[PDB]
């Protein structure tokens with residue numbers, strides 16, 4: 001079971017532009033609160049800053065990356081998010097979008 005989003009990398013802070021219905025159902029947030037925003041609103045008190053940095057750098061360098069993050073639903077309850085971000089390039093080598101697969105691996 002997994003969810004999927006698309007971030008717009010032509011915009012400077014990679015706002016989310018599409019999300020599967022499972023992403024909304026998993027996180028508790030609506031498209032009115034997800035679209036146009038950077039994915040980091042799902043982070044909170046216990047999110048590991050060393051892991052958050054791995055994504056920050058892979059996004060700046062335009063690489064693929066996979067990290068384990070503690071995330072929080074709209075109602076405040078936490079869950080463990082296995083997150084893999086893939087860069088999507090244009091033919092001229094520039095990154096156009098980042099795509100994300102999120103798995104809830106709280107098991």
Ligand SMILES: *[C@@]12=NC3=[C]C([C])=C([C])[C]=C3N([C][C]([O])[C]([O])[C]([O])[C]OP([O])([O])=O)C1=NC(=O)[N]C2=O
Nearest residue numbers: 007014038039040042043052055056098099100102
């Ligand atoms: C988030 N999923 C997610 C999906 C995509 C496609 C991208 C590009 C990023 C994410 N993030 C992280 C966020 O956008 C940001 O990259 C990181 O927070 C690190 O950079 P900052 O600005 O914080 O230093 C996701 N973050 C989550 O917590 N949950 C996801 O599902």
